[PDB]
Ligand binder design. Structure first.
Ligand SMILES: [Fe+3]
Length: 306
């Protein structure tokens, strides 16, 4: 008769799938509140000790870092933390990575050959790309991408870069519409996360668009971590801890990956071989903790007006 409340920043189908698999294993019912990572983080911030949320599940790590710094998250059970590499968990062990996603340049090969794509993410502020690419300034992983450009290239070059994106990029409300616009022939390329192509490929059967990976430790090769945590205010701590642990069990990871084409954070578990091999991503040397709350990046987004 215990009911957990899950605040789900991950994509709706993904949260529904993991919560269902946890219900089928344990008998515990999971009520879901779906929202944006930051929206939910702010909701928990204001509800504070009165929040009904038992577990929070996000697409990206800054909201977990933010909440962990506020003291709102519970220390996770050591057996749960032992399931991932330590750089994929909070430094104080009160949130844990569940899957990783990575930044891509989706493109339409009918409208641009692969050899003619930008060689670096930093190239997209050049005027020659004007009208040719989409990006998503409200996106949680885009915000991490900005943070990464600041850390790797410094504030002055990040500001110039993002000024160029505002001048020359095309704004999409979310990654789904950016991906569709590349597929539909409406924009030559777009910066999104890797898994969106696999969702559209499942729905339509075959696709015109293709994914380009910057690699080479480029700022654009960033890997970001979707994570989860138990709320310190939870009146069901044991059951909430079991839920997070189940998310990193083999069955839980598979249930998540059946809805999202992401990389498992469970040690020793491989992603679907249809993904670009994680080892070939060659991302910039940036951890979730390096990206932090992405506060400076958010400031830059607001200053530049995106
Ligand atoms: Fe997403």
């Amino acid at each position: 008769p215990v009911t957990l409340t899950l605040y789900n920043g991950q994509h709706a189908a993904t949260g529904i799938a993991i919560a269902k698999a946890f219900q089928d294993k344990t008998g515990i019912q999971v009520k879901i509140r779906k929202g944006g990572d930051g929206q939910l983080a702010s909701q928990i911030t204001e509800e504070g000790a009165r929040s009904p949320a038992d577990v929070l599940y996000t697409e990206e790590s800054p909201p977990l870092i933010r909440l962990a710094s506020a003291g709102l998250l519970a220390k996770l059970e050591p057996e749960t933390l032992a399931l991932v590499e330590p750089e994929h968990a909070g430094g104080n062990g009160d949130w844990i990575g569940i899957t990783a996603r990575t930044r891509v340049l989706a493109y339409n090969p009918k409208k641009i050959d692969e050899k003619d794509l930008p060689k670096s993410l930093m190239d997209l502020s050049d005027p020659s790309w004007s009208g040719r690419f989409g990006f998503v300034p409200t996106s949680g992983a885009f915000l991490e991408q900005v943070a990464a450009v600041i850390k790797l290239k410094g504030q002055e070059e990040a500001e110039d870069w993002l000024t160029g994106l505002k001048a020359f990029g095309s704004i999409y409300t979310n990654n789904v519409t950016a991906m569709k616009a590349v597929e539909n022939g409406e924009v030559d390329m777009a910066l999104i996360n890797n898994y969106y192509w696999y969702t559209l490929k499942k729905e339509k059967g075959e696709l015109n668009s293709r994914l380009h990976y910057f690699g080479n430790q480029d700022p654009g090769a960033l890997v970001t971590v979707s994570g989860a945590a138990v709320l310190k205010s939870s009146k069901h701590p044991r059951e909430a801890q079991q839920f997070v642990a189940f998310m990193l069990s083999e069955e839980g990871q598979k249930a998540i990956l059946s809805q999202s084409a992401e990389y498992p954070m469970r040690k020793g578990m491989q992603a679907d071989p249809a993904l670009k091999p994680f080892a070939e991503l060659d991302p910039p040397k940036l951890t979730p903790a390096d990206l932090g709350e992405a506060s400076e990046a958010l400031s830059l987004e607001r200053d530049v007006g995106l």
